[PDB]
Structure 1
Amino acid sequence: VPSHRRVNPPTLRMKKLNWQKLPSNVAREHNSMWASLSSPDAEAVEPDFSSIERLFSFPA
């Protein structure tokens, strides 16, 4: 249901970032940063997935 989880699946293989995964209940706390970002009234900046698929994908 949130906007940030609605990610289209990439056709090509993408490079992996490294970060430590926060729990979803901790990040959706009322004192937390990300519960207001999960609201649809917040500015959901849509990433240009075509440019990242063109640039940051794995070369064959």
Structure 2
Amino acid sequence: VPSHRRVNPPTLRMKKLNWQKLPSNVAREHNSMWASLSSPDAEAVEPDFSSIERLFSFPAAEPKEITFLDAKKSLNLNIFLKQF
């Protein structure tokens, strides 16, 4: 049962995850891990495709304290004043 291949097509353009794809006949060996996944009684996790389609798709196209000094001399005066 090809449960891994039964995926809906996406609405938006997706960022391509590059990988080295195996041949199919190599993947259908007797001792293969993918052969054990191909049994339908194995444990399968359903992904939430909505958030993956949401995020990984391509993007498209006041006078409180008035002073007459500058800030440097005022803060130097604050350091001078608050130590008293």
Mark yes or no: TM-score above 0.5: yes
Provide the C-alpha distance between the structure 2 equivalents of 1:46 and 1:27, rounded to a whole number of angstroms: 22
Provide the C-alpha distance between the structure 1 equivalents of 2:11 and 2:23, rounded to a whole number of angstroms: 28
User: Is the partner of 1:21 in helix, strand or coil?
Assistant: coil
Q: Determine which structure has more spread, i.e. the larger CA radius of gyration.
A: 2
Structure 1, unaligned runs of 5 or more: none
Percent identity (aligned): 100
Structure 2, unaligned runs of 5 or more: 60-84
> Offset of 1:23 from its aligned partner?
0.9
Instruction: State the TM-score, normalizing by the size of structure 1.
Output: 0.89
Provide the C-alpha distance between the structure 1 equivalents of 2:2 and 2:51, rounded to a whole number of angstroms: 23
Query: Runs of at least 4 residues of structure 1 off by over 3 A?
Result: none
> Offset of 1:44 from its aligned partner?
1.5
RMSD, aligned α-carbons:
1.0
> Offset of 1:24 from its aligned partner?
1.2
- Between 1 and 2, higher relative CO (CA 8 Å, sep ≥ 6) is seen in 1
